[PDB]
């Protein structure tokens, strides 16, 4: 029984944040848990304060009728209990629930470590006769209590973009509302705990530079290369595999190259040596104790500035 | 109360996605948000434009006799939330729910890198007494919403095979149809995540072919051995062990080949020389620099000419 | 309000399999979504055909008195949606829900790779009053959904123990049914996945017994040990550990020892080459390369006649 | 509505387990489908046996007043569906569910391999006016249906402390029960998977009491460092950490102190050896190859005694 | 229907812990099973004791007007029983619900192996129309049920903080009420299962201070930089990755810090030595034996003080 009027429906609507939190990193999906406000004139319920009651009235979701509010990109239904209804003379209702859903948004991870996210969460409403459109009270959708956290995450801000898009959807038109949580990852650890140990382990590797005998050169860059595989397994994390190709995964992919060619050279250096050529042998040797670290050092340049400052 | 009519009742459906996600290439199912359209005549319920009412009258599920359409491949319940009922003058229902369910589809891997995928969508209805048919309208069916994705794969279209299968189960017919949600995986960072490192791995294996020290050959290659396995550790992936022989597993049982007659060559070049013969160890070493590189660049094209160019 | 009758009251029973899926090898355990058709004479409630109504009357679960049929073998309750009810002019009603329960079936891995096992789906009631005993027809019973399948195995037959087991438990008895479904694990890419590679690393490891230094017997045989640990680790199953001793743990067991009776050969090699006595030690040393593959295959032979001939 | 008495109101309870599963190492709990049976005396539902209707008279929980049994160690609420409810002629009611909980119990690994626990199963009541006391009827307390299984466990007794603890707790006394489920860990397969291969190993370690080259030694016991720590990641088991001190962690210990002065031994060795002094050296080797095997027999006999036979 | 009063509504409140459970330390949540107690002044069912009824009069939550008490870090709903509803002659209402909810409370892991963390639970109330305030009753909130537990801690004490902090939230007080279960990590295996293992390891590492060969000391550092990857791997823990930096990830960088100069050590002493220099190579390596354990215990005392003594 929705209210008739002389024109388009306008439902003001508007997010309070209570609780963010499951980033899930893996499905790009997270839960919130925050409040939801609607209101709207239905004067058909309009009443008499002096005549009879109080100020406000209040009544149950059984009474009147209530739009249907539907979040978009949520896995299930959007858990929901109803806090309050008060309908204001003039027949302004104020609708008030708190709900807890998971919202599916999409994750970019191509700058992993140093990266920022905007979440979404998607409200429409389908249009039963009377044309609805949504739009947000700025007010009620300060949605950011100041201590709500995602544990990795920085929260800059939580806001609401004001232009509906309606769209026309079999046959009936449906409008639809953005709102947009925007974080950015948190990365003290990821120096001491990832790169630097992945980093110690490669100069280890071509420590053979400075060495000569085959036996203890491959006991040197190999015994590394399963070290380097070891320590990827014990900091294995969710998205590192990823379908785009990200940037972590870029270095990630240089480190093999740079073992290979360490096997490259130690495996030249000894053929040379062991082909009566000794000069050579110490000679790309003596290159590769530069070469390496610059070579790294500038694709690493190239590759920061590729992602980044690009 | 169903609709008593003179001949078979056919039943037009329709979905239209809002959301996939959960890609389970283990448990080979998928979840999918959508949109679920029918349509019949119901002429018991006609009504009288002019005498009453206004152009369209809406109902309660309770109120009117709803055909149960129920999903084949699901695993449980088909989570609905009904969004709207619509009677026609003549009788036409128009039913639309919103409806999210976990969908059981077999996947097949045998291409695993690079493979597509069609996911299917089972509708039936069985006949409480009068005959129920359903079909499809393309309207309704439009399913894919734009902005509607799966992380690792492209979505080609989402379409339905207008001919229903009419079964007989229990002495009442029943109609199906068949929805396709036709995919195929992206697979940028395989080649630079997955091959390529299995692949340096393997070359350093076969450094030995330039090299005489024994114990930096066993130091070589089965140390390397150990990285391969490692390194398999480190990028092990949902569907890795599979029941039928993929072709990834191919290839991949192919390296473990391998370092076996890698191994064996190493072996062998060993008791030749150390048995006064090192005329014929050097000779097989210096074979093995170009039979190891061609056997393997030719049994991978005979590999995927078996699974793909076949 | 139970049906009086002159004698016990059957019930006749049906499962018809329209999905099987989930099992768990690691929970003993396995999901279905099927049919459940009931029926028993209810005189109670015979209509007159000819006087009112037609062939036959629908009714609500909330009018008619049903059986409370429970399963044993279930996790938690036996998510149920009524698809009909359909009462005949004598009294017999024909029940029928589309149910999806997590089954609770021990498994036998007694035989790992090539093992058959038969889940178990149990059906009792209890006695409210009447005697209540429940049976099968075998009509509703064709459980088996063509397209029904389980990844890894092969579905042989779904039947059904026509004998019910009338218990007597706390002053009532109660009729247990028993539905068996029969699979045979189905293990193409264990040969080329698990078997074969875990024999090459072994083979490698026994390589040494065409050696004689000691570096590198044991950077042979120590180094292929933590091969074999990682690639177990690689190859890593639900079901590896149980409690009871499969079949592919004593051949995995038996991998163990060979590993260390090389460690033993190859040290006993050395003490007697060192001890100035290699008449001895590369006798014995000429001795395992023909008694290690030998052993194997015997033992492997007596171990295969042992769980599979026995 | 209680019923009225003269004096304290007991309760007969009963547990019926026909399902017990899901024993969680982990996080201590375990999960049981049961029946439970309640009876106590209500006069003021007392029936006339001739007068009117039969033996016994069946009613609907919400025509009764029930007495509300809830359990003290349990997750969630205890799902429950009531199967039947008898009231007798004197007033004595026969309520009967069939419930499935996960109960909270604690679980003490200080034995791990071979250990046996007591589960609990925490009934109580509140007393709403009248004092409400919960007692045990030993018939109805049966609770174990033949076929019932932990599959790593064996089933000892399935019993009930008859003396109720009661309780007062806010103002209104409680009554408790404590219903017991013994189990013994089975462990057949802890000997060859667990416990042999990381002798073996170990074994394997110390055979470089019977070699001179430090370079075959490092890669002797370091490697096989590795393989222990390996072999214990495939072993890897639920329980393997826990915040008290394990006997299976005590050894485990012991075996990384084994590594650590087998290290030391061979270090010590190569000093005496390379500092002009091989008599010392090749002396306290000598010792080593009866020290290490003598100390740990004795101190495993040691630790047995201490966690076993104390 | 509010309860009409001449000033703000106090509603006391008490929470009484029966279970504690299942503390995830990954996503800093925690599972309660407790009793909730609500009493409120409600004259307008202040009832008549001499004239009608009795002591105290019972009543159904449809009944009567209860505050809604929301938790605001709860990640769903508060799965709620009612237990008792008991009104006093005055109008005093006593509520008492058992409840279970899963609790989202930040941890810090700064200290992580002797860690004490303080978890809440946070209890609000809307104010309908006229103002609600809630607060404490102690006798109500002795929370801890003495058999209460948290496996891998110490439970202090379950108090809650008397003074509400009363917000304006949407044009609406609300009174927020902070309750605090405070625990204390119980750390005895971590000595023997975490850290002196990797201690041993590390010890084992730079044993190649009293050795010459550059092989074994390569065979010797390298190999247990595997063997300290592969034991962090064995011993990984859920809080093992943390964004910010805990002090147990400093330490373990400390010893990745003392494998690199390590292998700086044993390269500079070959280079050295092979340099025709070995006065300054054998000088290096003899302050290496008290150089790596002194600047070990020194900047771990230096890392103790910093993150506990500060």
Redesign the interface.
């Known amino acids: 029984p929705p209210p008739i009027a002389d024109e388009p429906l306008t439902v003001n609507t508007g997010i ?1 944040l ?2 963010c ?2 980033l899930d990193d893996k ?2 999906t997270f ?1 919130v ?1 925050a ?1 939801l ?1 609607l209101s709207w004139k239905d004067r058909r319920l309009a009443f008499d304060p002096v005549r009879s009651g109080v100020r ?1 009235k ?1 009544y149950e979701p059984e009474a009147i009728w209530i739009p ?1 509010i ?1 979040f ?6 959007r ?1 929901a ?1 109803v ?2 209804i008060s309908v204001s003379p003039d027949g302004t209702v104020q609708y ?1 629930e ?1 709900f ?1 859903a998971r919202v ?1 948004s ?1 994750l970019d991870f191509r700058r992993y470590p140093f990266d920022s996210q905007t979440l979404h969460i998607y409200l429409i409403v ?1 249009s ?2 009377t044309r609805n459109i949504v739009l947000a009270v700025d ?2 959708k300060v949605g950011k209590n100041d201590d709500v ?1 995602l ?3 920085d929260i800059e801000s939580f806001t609401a973009v004001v232009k509906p898009a309606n769209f026309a ?2 046959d ?1 038109l449906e409008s639809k509302l953005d709102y947009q949580l925007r974080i950015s990852r ?4 990821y120096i ?2 990832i790169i ?2 992945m980093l ?2 490669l ?2 590797s071509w ?1 053979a530079f ?7 050169n ?3 860059v ?6 380097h ?9 969710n998205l590192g ?6 940037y972590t ?2 270095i990630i ?1 240089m480190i ?2 740079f ?2 060619v360490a ?1 490259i050279e130690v ?1 030249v250096q ?2 040379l040596k ?1 082909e009566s050529q000794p000069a050579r042998a110490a000679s790309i040797t003596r290159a590769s104790r530069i070469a390496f670290p610059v070579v790294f050092l500038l694709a690493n340049i190239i590759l920061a500035f590729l992602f980044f400052g690009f």
């Open positions: 309070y209570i609780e939190y499951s499905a790009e839960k848990n409040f406000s406000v209040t249907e539907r978009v990109n949520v896995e299930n239904a858990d209990d806090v309050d008030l708190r807890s599916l999409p389908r039963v006769d007010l009620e956290f544990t990795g995450w959807l079999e009936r948190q990365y003290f650890s001491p705990n630097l140990p110690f382990i100069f280890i420590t400075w060495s000569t005998s085959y036996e203890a491959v006991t040197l190999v015994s590394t290369l399963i070290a595989i070891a320590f990827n397994i014990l900091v294995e994390t595999k990823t379908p785009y190709m990200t995964g870029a992919f093999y190259l073992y290979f096997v495996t000894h053929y062991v």
